């Protein structure tokens, strides 16, 4: 729907300037041409608009990172392919992530916002798991691999979250590519440790 997109485009731009609080549904109308009644019929409220806008930025973020099956064979080893793309996006410091971390830390979340935060978070965790399953030896029993992959995934997600905060709070001195390289090296060392933990 093209009418949905103009509302979100208007809201993005309007929130880039002016902030969320100082932006009125009226202001959104002025920008996108859709009447307030029309905006409500779509997203239900002002918070509903931010929710849908947040979810859109997510899909664009994730679509720029290839799934394991979308990368090639292995080359360079192909978990590396994903890492390269993740590094690329993260090095550009996406403001989408700023919003995600902000909204996930807010008390009294709007139900629509809470659902979107939950889904984006689950997708992120899923995308990491998709990549990390292929880092384990072929001969691990499925139940054991599940445990190890899960614990490795939580570790990767945690480090990746912290990389954004590094890039945010230490933008001048933070090397994103280097930090993610340490993660890949950390994961490689942890795999034997986890497999033999009884």
Number of H helices, E strands in the chain: 9, 0
Q: Is 139 helix (H, G, I), strand (E, B) or coil?
A: coil
115 binds a second copy (CB under 8 A): no
User: Which residue number, 106 or 146, has a Cβ lying nearer to a second copy?
Assistant: 106
82 binds Na ion (CB under 5 A): yes
2 binds a second copy (CB under 8 A): no
Note whether 54 and 140 are within 8 A (CB).
no
What string marks each residue from 89 to 108 as x (binds a second copy by CB under 8 A) or -?
A: ---------x--xx-xxxxx
Question: Rounded to a whole number, what is the distance in angstroms from the first to the last CA of the chain?
Answer: 53
Residues 114-143 that bind Na ion (CB under 5 A): 131
168 binds a second copy (CB under 8 A): yes
Residue 131 interacting partner from Na ion, a second copy, none (CB closer than 5 to 8 Å by kind): Na ion
**31: enclosing H helix or E strand:** helix 25-32
Determine the distance from the C-alpha atom of residue 151 to the mean position of all C-alpha atoms in its chain, rounded to a whole number: 19
What lies within 8 Å, CB to CB, of 12 at 6+ separation is 53
Rule CB under 8 A: which residues touch a second copy?
Answer: 19, 98, 101-102, 104-108, 117-118, 121, 151, 154-155, 157-163, 165-166, 168-170, 174, 178-179, 182, 185-186, 189-190, 193
């Amino acid at each position: 729907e093209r009418s949905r997109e103009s509302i979100l485009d208007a809201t993005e731009r309007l929130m880039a300037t002016k902030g969320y609080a100082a932006t009125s549904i009226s202001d959104i109308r002025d920008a996108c041409g859709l009447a307030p009644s029309s905006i409500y019929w779509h997203f239900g409220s002002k918070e509903g608009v931010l929710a849908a806008m947040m979810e859109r930025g997510a899909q664009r973020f994730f679509a720029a990172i290839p799934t394991w099956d979308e990368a090639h064979g292995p080359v360079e080893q192909r978990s590396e392919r994903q890492l390269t793309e993740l590094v690329s996006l993260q090095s550009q410091h996406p403001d989408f992530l700023r919003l995600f971390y902000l909204l996930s830390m807010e008390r009294s979340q709007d139900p629509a916002v809470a659902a979107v935060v939950r889904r984006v978070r689950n997708t992120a965790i899923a995308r990491f798991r998709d990549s990390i399953t292929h880092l384990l030896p072929s001969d691990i029993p499925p139940g054991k691999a599940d445990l190890v992959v899960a614990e490795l995934t939580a570790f990767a997600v945690a480090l990746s979250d912290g990389v954004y905060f590094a890039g945010h709070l230490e933008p001048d001195t933070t090397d994103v590519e280097r930090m993610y390289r340490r993660l890949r090296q950390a994961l490689e060392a942890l795999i034997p440790v986890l497999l033999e933990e009884t």
